[PDB]
User: Fold this.
Amino acid sequence: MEVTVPATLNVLNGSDARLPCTFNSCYTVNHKQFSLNWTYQECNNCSEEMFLQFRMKIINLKLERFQDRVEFSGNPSKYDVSVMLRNVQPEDEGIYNCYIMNPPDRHRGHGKIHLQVLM
Amino acid sequence: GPQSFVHFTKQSLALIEQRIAERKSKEPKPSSDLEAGKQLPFIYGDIPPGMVSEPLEDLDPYYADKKTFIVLNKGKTIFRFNATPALYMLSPFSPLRRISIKILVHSLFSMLIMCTILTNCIFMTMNNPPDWTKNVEYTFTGIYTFESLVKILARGFCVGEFTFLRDPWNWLDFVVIVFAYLTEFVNNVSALRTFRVLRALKTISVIPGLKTIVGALIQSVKKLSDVMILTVFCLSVFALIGLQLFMGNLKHKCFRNSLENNETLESIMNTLESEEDFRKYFYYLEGSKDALLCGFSTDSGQCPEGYTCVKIGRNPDYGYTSFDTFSWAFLALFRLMTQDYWENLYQQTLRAAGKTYMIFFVVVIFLGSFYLINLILAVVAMAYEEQNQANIEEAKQPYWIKFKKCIYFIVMDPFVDLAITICIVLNTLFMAMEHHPMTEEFKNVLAIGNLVFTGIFAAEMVLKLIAMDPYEYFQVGWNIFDSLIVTLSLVELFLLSVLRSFRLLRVFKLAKSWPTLNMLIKIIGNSVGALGNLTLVLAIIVFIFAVVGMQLFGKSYKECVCKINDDCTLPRWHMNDFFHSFLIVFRVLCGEWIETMWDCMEVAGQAMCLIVYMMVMVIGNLVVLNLFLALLLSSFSSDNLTAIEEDPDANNLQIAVTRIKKGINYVKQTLREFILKAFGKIWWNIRKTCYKIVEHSWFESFIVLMILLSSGALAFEDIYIERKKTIKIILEYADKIFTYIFILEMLLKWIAYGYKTYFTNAWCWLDFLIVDVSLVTLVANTLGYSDLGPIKSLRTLRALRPLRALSRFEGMRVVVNALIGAIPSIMNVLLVCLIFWLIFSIMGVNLFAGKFYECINTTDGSRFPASQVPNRSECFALMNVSQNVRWKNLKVNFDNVGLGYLSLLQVATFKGWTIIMYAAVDSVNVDKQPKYEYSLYMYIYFVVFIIFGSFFTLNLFIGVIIDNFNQQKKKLGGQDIFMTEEQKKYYNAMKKLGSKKPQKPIPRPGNKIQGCIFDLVTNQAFDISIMVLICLNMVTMMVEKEGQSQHMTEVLYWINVVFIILFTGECVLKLISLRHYYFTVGWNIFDFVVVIISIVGMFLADLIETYFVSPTLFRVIRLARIGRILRLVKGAKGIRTLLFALMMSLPALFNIGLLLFLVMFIYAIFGMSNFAYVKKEDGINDMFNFETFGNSMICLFQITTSAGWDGLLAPILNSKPPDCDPKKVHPGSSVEGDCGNPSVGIFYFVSYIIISFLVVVNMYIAVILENFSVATE
Amino acid sequence: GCVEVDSETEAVYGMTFKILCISCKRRSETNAETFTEWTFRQKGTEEFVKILRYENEVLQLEEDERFEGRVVWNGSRGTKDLQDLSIFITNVTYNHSGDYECHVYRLLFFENYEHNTSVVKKIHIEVVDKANRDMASIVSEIMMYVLIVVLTIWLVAEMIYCYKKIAAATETA
Ligand SMILES: CC(C)CCC[C@@H](C)[C@H]1CC[C@H]2[C@@H]3CC=C4C[C@@H](OC(=O)CCC(=O)O)CC[C@]4(C)[C@H]3CC[C@]12C
Ligand SMILES: CC(C)CCC[C@@H](C)[C@H]1CC[C@H]2[C@@H]3CC=C4C[C@@H](OC(=O)CCC(=O)O)CC[C@]4(C)[C@H]3CC[C@]12C
Ligand SMILES: *[C@@H]1O[C@H](CO)[C@@H](O[C@@H]2O[C@H](CO)[C@@H](O)[C@H](O)[C@H]2NC(C)=O)[C@H](O)[C@H]1NC(C)=O
Ligand SMILES: *[C@@H]1O[C@H](CO)[C@@H](O[C@@H]2O[C@H](CO)[C@@H](O)[C@H](O)[C@H]2NC(C)=O)[C@H](O)[C@H]1NC(C)=O
Ligand SMILES: Nc1nc2ccc(OC(F)(F)F)cc2s1
Ligand SMILES: *[C@@H]1O[C@H](CO)[C@@H](O)[C@H](O)[C@H]1NC(C)=O
Ligand SMILES: *[C@@H]1O[C@H](CO)[C@@H](O)[C@H](O)[C@H]1NC(C)=O
Ligand SMILES: *[C@@H]1O[C@H](CO)[C@@H](O)[C@H](O)[C@H]1NC(C)=O
Ligand SMILES: *[C@@H]1O[C@H](CO)[C@@H](O)[C@H](O)[C@H]1NC(C)=O
Assistant:
């Protein structure tokens, strides 16, 4: 599937950010089979940390580096898996990934967003 | 005159302006001979040297008033430019304007544009292009822009009347150019790339002669207006009937009787989403995507024990096969009319509703599918024939010579030609002996014989060339291709499996001696000769459709694959690449458009797929029909003049046979000479008495009644006869009595007519043979040898008893006489067909002999992947390990020439062709496991066959039979050959209703109020108001669907009640206005009956819906409303004539239907006797089989249209284990074994389809004759 | 095929009689595992006493003196999906006259579904010393002969009348 994400996302400090991640798959999304992996990495070659996942329902693992500031803001039924955020300090800057698997589709997708925190 | 070539100069322009002033002061047609795009008239002679391509003074005085000039191009083509300043900036006298003009007029410009267009048409076939395919597209856009600017500068944009934008083909070109650059500036990719396909249509503009025939097609379609209106109205009426009868019946399913966990039907329904869960609660047949249909009647499908029939779920075929809504009903009725996969809908509807509903399908098939198709076919022929007549009318308005002479005398003799002909026949016969399991000795014999034959042919090649040399040799058409073929054979001998089959084309040398094969060659030559432009337009249209389909749906076919194939891989028929898109388009042309469109819908949207498929079907069928009728009429009318003498120079074969007969006569005379030299009054009165008795009407009627009874008694021998123990014996003794009666009748026929007058009669011979068979069987049964092998098998010939009615019923006798008269030409055409098909059968044998085997898993019947078990040795090694593994072969294949003939028949009728094609394209080798589409481009073999041996051949047969029936009618002296003498006078009386003069207006009432009411009710405004009310009622009927709410039901009921009261009011008004004159008009009495029947139905449906409970009766009686919408015909002069033609044709169709019913009855009895116990697989079912007379008649009516005959034949081709069990025990009967008889099955199912084809062409003769009569007179 | 032919109801003393009990399933393509039980109520008795049971290709005969060594299976053989459940009497006596009952216990095997169904068929058998002829055969033969003779007489009468008229006309001419 094709995934449409912004390559660069500049968000002012002290403001709520939102990560647009959308994909197109011909098959109606089934909540009993959708597999989703939101991961964050400090860099391209850095380790990716999983912070939000959809196995049967939206489950947020509440990593300490994000506290409770991570909220789901999309809707898989309408193919929107975007993640919205609460106000920030510059440490949140990094790379965000949304891996998507929508069976019976064969291929697996990956959309990359390079979040940036402005002064 | 040659002097009239003056230039266009200052003085010329001044004269033009003076003439414009004269025309203004004055304030017709231009010279057709000087119309632009035509050749220069011969009066003007040769163009002077220096004046080619120069702006010349207008050559037509009609334009002397206006400012326009002429430029003449090499080839005498007249290009009419405009003298007004181009763009308002330039003028005819300009350095750039003249250059652009000459460039556009030149040929190299046209050749360059055509080359660019045809290269772009090759680059359009790449589904995904490489990245470098952008410089080429930039080059194409540059070339097109250069051409556009050249035309702009040559002839102005839009300044005057003779400009760029005047030509309609310029609107397409500019609309493309703008989109290309506009899109590049923008940079849905699919739509933008689809708009590029319009560049292909420029081929029609550039290639000479295609524009005129495209215009001809557009002019021909305009004649199909009345026919299309009638077709739409008839399909709408039948769709309303179907939507009323079968609303929601296809949602029937078998539901579990016992549930658990307090689960109800709705609770179960609102959870299941996948087929593996649906299969747990509904009955699915193994390997089926749709739940088994069931019905609530006694003659419907029966669910297993523990399953109950309920109406819930979705309709079959992804939900597209339904009668629930008017749109789906209309789609189903269009599918029925086109007879595309209609047997599946037939079977589904009968299983869901009941077998007594086959009457609906009979009426639809024999009133809409076979008649409305003939109106379209007849109208186009009349439209084409009128065009052709106008075209004809417009056209009317030292040592070398020693060997040379010797060899010439040796070879150029009649005997050698006959020897070569026999050699060709023997070589073809030798090639026809190939088959798959061929031993090495047989293979060596075949190779040696082929070498001998090719050596003989090469020898004669060299002999003839040395005899006359290659200057005189290469001047003969037959010689050219003979040399080509011998060269190819030599190449093959020196060197695959195709070049060996090119010697088969030598069979066409027999065309010289064979008049009716020259007709086939002439048809083929015309298709690429006179009508080559039409064939080219057909090719261009098919290419455009393939490209459009690919561009639109290729990406979807791949992305949404799991919606149409559970393996998530592309199905057999898709649009993902150009070859498969073209295959789908060709299949649609062949006539199969629903199976491949269901997947299209599922992947890429109903609106898009429907629009594309409807456009493809309509336009492609129009072009194919135009080509077919053009070839037919042109070829079969060109030779009518007898323009050349019959064999003026006798053919070498004719001379050889003449010499042979002369020699035979000489030998006979010599031998005869040598052998002769060496060595009663009472009897006559009795005969007269018997004549009197047997000629009596009472005797004839009694014997006819006995014939009917004895033929009907044959329908009681079902498999259930053992339950009817009294009927058994009653029928036995009735059979004995019938035998006695017919023996006495034959004896009286003898004693009356005489042993000569009786036995010189074919009808008497038939009756004698039937009674003799009956007597022999009776004697054998009485003597105790009833079960004696062939004697027992003779009992099966009692199915021929119905044949005794042909001589008794004049309606069938007349049609039988026509068929007997037409037989000879049918045999000639069949001979040519068999010879032509032998070539393709041999080629198919050489291509596919023994390569249809495969190793399958008998549980799911799935071919093993070739990664494992790649050959037969490994298949057997796997057999020894597992148990449910089989090395199977197709039952219809190309293993030898006979099975090749059967396969070619199935392909030409389009029934088993998919099953054969899949194996053909999968074939790898002999003893090798097939791989998926290993030989993908084998589809071309079947494409080329379906063209040559099923389109040109059908054209030839249709022409021959039409000419033969015309000759028969001429011999009778302009008498209808399908009507009996009594029906002739009724036909003549009916004819007068089409030419009645208008009657006097009804006199006004002599009463003050009645006169006003008459004046009001006799108005065109009143008629139009009633027509619009009928249309609104039709819309109200159409707005009804399945699952509608009770409020919708109530409002629709009240609307219909209001319409009923309005029509009753109109009836009352017309009554009080026209008094007793009212009932003198047939349409008015029809309105009266319709009104009364509507009221009665409305009042009676309440009783059927309030006290009695009979949904079937309620639905049947609610059909009385369609009588209200049938009144639309009265105000349609267009379709009334066509329905009158149908009414006039009915008398002839009755006889043909009677004969067809008799043939169907005979074949039904034979099928009951033979195929009652064969194994139930493929097309033989619990409901569609030969166990009973009704089931047999259902199957036979189905296959009368040639639908599913392969599926009915397949179960009968099992004759050995493990396919069938020869000693299976059937409870309740003594018959053993469920095996079929392959030879009897093949004979049965081939002969029946051939006979039905002959009867169907008889019906098209009758319909065409009546349509022509009604259109003319 | 499968046709439920009703059993005969007349056995001749001393010979062999086959009692028919055919039970066909609604859909022939389904799978099943059938077994049967027969019960017999002798004339003059009011109790149905089980006499035999057949399952898994083995006939288990009860210890009944009236049927000992006089019954053999005549049903479907070599399968567990029985549709013919007949039995054969190898030596018919007067104790074999009464109402029979053929119980069929069929167990369909569906997809994630098992249905245990049952049927009962009643056969009444009367034992006689001679085999009576069928009344339908009697009437059919008599009707055939009367119709044949009637047709012959009618044709002969018509021939005689027409010939006498022909001779009279010829003598007039
Ligand atoms: C090709 C072989 C292996 C299989 C078929 C046998 C052929 C040797 C036969 C089949 C039909 C025959 C043809 C059928 C009829 C004619 C027309 C005949 O012309 C006439 O003089 C007859 C006039 C007429 O009745 O039309 C000349 C021979 C020819 C071409 C025959 C040539 C020999 C043919 C091709
Ligand atoms: C005009 C007359 C003489 C022939 C009419 C039938 C043709 C359309 C047939 C005859 C031979 C056929 C060809 C024979 C062999 C092949 C190879 C076949 O591919 C393979 O066999 C697979 C090879 C591989 O993958 O290794 C693809 C189709 C093709 C070109 C066939 C295309 C269809 C052809 C031209
Ligand atoms: C033939 O096909 C059948 C059915 O697909 C195979 O038998 C079972 O198939 C299922 C999958 O539908 C497997 O899960 C089972 O393990 C199979 N049963 C076995 C092996 O007993 C069967 O394997 C196939 N035949 C061969 C020779 O592989
Ligand atoms: C199917 O039904 C039959 C008949 O009711 C069952 O057979 C009975 O089973 C019970 C025990 O569950 C016994 O006490 C009866 O004596 C049996 N009667 C007969 C005539 O056999 C049978 O158990 C059922 N089969 C299944 C698989 O449930
Ligand atoms: N060989 C063939 N037998 C038949 C019988 C009926 C038929 O109807 C159709 F509409 F297809 F022409 C076609 C054919 S082709
Ligand atoms: C009825 O449904 C309840 C759950 O609502 C369940 O506990 C009970 O077993 C069910 N009874 C039956 C007979 O299905
Ligand atoms: C076939 O199978 C049998 C039993 O498994 C085995 O004994 C025998 O050797 C096998 N034969 C062949 C030819 O593989
Ligand atoms: C028949 O029944 C009688 C008792 O009514 C018994 O005495 C006799 O032995 C029986 N015969 C057989 C063969 O069972
Ligand atoms: C039946 O049994 C009786 C008594 O044993 C015997 O007389 C008779 O022959 C037997 N009949 C047959 C057909 O075995």
Residues 32 and 56 of chain A are 6 Å apart (CA to CA). Residues 1-119 of chain A form a domain with the Immunoglobulin-like fold (CATH 2.60.40.10). The interface with chain B takes residues 26-27, 30, 104-106 of chain A (CB under 8 Å). Chain A is about 0% helix and 45% strand.
